[PDB]
Amino acid sequence: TLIELMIVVAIIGILAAIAIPQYQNYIAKSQVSRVMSETGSLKTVIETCILDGKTAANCELGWTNSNLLG
Amino acid sequence: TLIELMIVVAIIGILAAIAIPQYQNYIAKSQVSRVMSETGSLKTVIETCILDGKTAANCELGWTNSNLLG
């Protein structure tokens, strides 16, 4: 019957109009936290170099490239 | 809610791709420092033997077998 198909169309329209949360916040926060951890890992080597009296060129960083450029 | 699951998958991929610093440097430095300390501990015995006039076979080392290889 026509009314059943119209109800199906209405249900499809209702489902398609679901509110989408701003998922950008979660991804951005996770990426910033990952960069936070990655950059804070270098604090140990930087502090040891500074307290050892080494120059900038003599401080060996164990840095590996990060895909976030952080 | 497919977008939510794909955001979850993206977050998992972001977390799994964290940059790992070269931890080999820390372990190597610690092991070399420990070997330095253990080998320098024998300087007292060697100096005492030399200043006493003992031969190589008469110098009693207090050395104990060590992991690593000294």
UniProtKB/TrEMBL annotation, chains A, B:
The pili are polar flexible filaments of about 5.4 nanometers diameter and 2.5 micrometers average length; they consist of only a single polypeptide chain arranged in a helical configuration of five subunits per turn in the assembled pilus. Disulfide bonds join C49-C59. Signal peptide: none annotated. Belongs to the N-Me-Phe pilin family. This is Fimbrial protein. The chain crosses the membrane at residues 1-20.
